[PDB]
Amino acid sequence: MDTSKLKPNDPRVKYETKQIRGKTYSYILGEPAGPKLETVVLVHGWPDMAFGWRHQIPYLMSLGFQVVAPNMLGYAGTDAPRDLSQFTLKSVSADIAELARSFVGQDGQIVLGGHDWGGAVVWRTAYYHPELVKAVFSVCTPLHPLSAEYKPLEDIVAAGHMLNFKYQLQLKGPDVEARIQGKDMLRRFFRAMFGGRGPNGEAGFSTSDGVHFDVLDKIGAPPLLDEQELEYYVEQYALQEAPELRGPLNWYRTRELNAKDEMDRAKNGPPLRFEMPALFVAASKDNALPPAMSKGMDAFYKDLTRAEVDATHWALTQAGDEVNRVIGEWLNKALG
């Protein structure tokens, strides 16, 4: 089979929905070349969608894997509940567990991979559902420990800490949700988020201040999406009810809910400990998720493989071939 990246509306895969824990979940389903060896579930982040795995999906199919890549809660053809408790890592992990078992059966196991917010999801899924997850990998996103405390991000950055996360204040508030509505604004947003620049090279997004709305009308073509890829992101995001970014931005509105879930697990529940094979792929030039942030993470794993790829945040695509071979070689070791 052709292993080149999925194009928009690619015919090598199926596009389906299933009811999952009270929500319509849409996903990409790729069937294996040859006998099915494993099922791989792939979890994207923000502001991405299942199509963000376009380089990995046909590659994994060619190796004999069934691939299920959902549009996560809030995104594209998937429901965007009003209730923020649906957007917690624990609830979305349970969604993933039910969706995965709808393919492999309740007794089955999966390989689970994530990027960005999806990487945070898959570490929690392997923690909440060890019965299900045979092997787990994350691109860019390292492990964070179980939250023992909750402090508003406002106070954290006001104290001079976690300043590379300050854009999340803007994302969780009203401004992006209110201003980025409709296809034409979504297109400008995606030009910014995938590397487009203004007439004098100004960025459309920063980790300090978030989306730079005044740059958006003059932002040029993104280097990390071709024109039809850009338009597919616009079209798919436009499936959401106005305001279209409510669902995706709800992921930044769960800090307190997630903390409450995990302060519990951190006192009664089992410790964070991954006995199954795990892979962490860092990205050299990710300024939100720099490799240095993964420093103390190996102690939580019996069997963690580390890799680094020379790419920005959008490593699945910009370094797609290298990421593919890191994953494929690790799976050779992890599954056999």
Q: How far is the CB of 95 from ligand AUB (least distance, A)?
A: 17
3 state SS for the chain: CCCCCCCCCCCCCEEEEEEECCEEEEEEEECCCCCCCEEEEEECCCCCCHHHHCCHHHHHHHCCEEEEEECCCCCCCCCCCCCHHHHCHHHHHHHHHHHHHHHHCCCCCEEEEEECHHHHHHHHHHHHCCCCEEEEEEECCCCCCCCCCCCCHHHHHHCCCCHHHCHHHHHHCCHHHHHCCHHHHHHHHHHHHCCCECCCCCECEECCCEECHHHHCCCCCCCCCCHHHHHHHHHHHCCCCCCCCHHHHHHHHCHHHHHHHHHHHHHCCCCCCECCCEEEEEECCCCCCCHHHHCCHHHHECCEEEEEECCCCCHHHHCHHHHHHHHHHHHHHHHC
Q: Using alpha carbons, select from 110, 124, 119, 149 the residue that is nearest to residue 137.
A: 119
Q: How far apart are CA 305 and CA 274, in angstroms?
A: 12
Active site residue 144: no
Residues that bind ligand AUB (CB under 6 A): 45-46, 116-117, 120, 141, 193, 195, 205, 288-289, 312-314
Find the catalytic residue in 48, 95, 116, 261: 116
In the complex, the smallest distance separating the C-beta of residue 37 from ligand AUB, rounded to whole angstroms, is 29
Active site residue 161: no
Least distance between ligand AUB and beta carbon 204 (Å):
8
Residue 124: CB minimum distance to ligand AUB, A = 10
CB contact at 8 A, 90 and 124:
yes
- Residue placing its CB nearer to ligand AUB in the complex, 30 or 52: 52
CB of 116 to ligand AUB, least distance (A): 5
For residue 105 the two structure tokens come to 């059966």
Nearest to ligand AUB of 63, 146 (CB atom): 146
Which structure tokens are listed for 283?
């990205």
Query: What's the min distance (Å) between Cβ of 195 and ligand AUB?
Result: 4
Catalytically active residues, by annotation: 116, 313
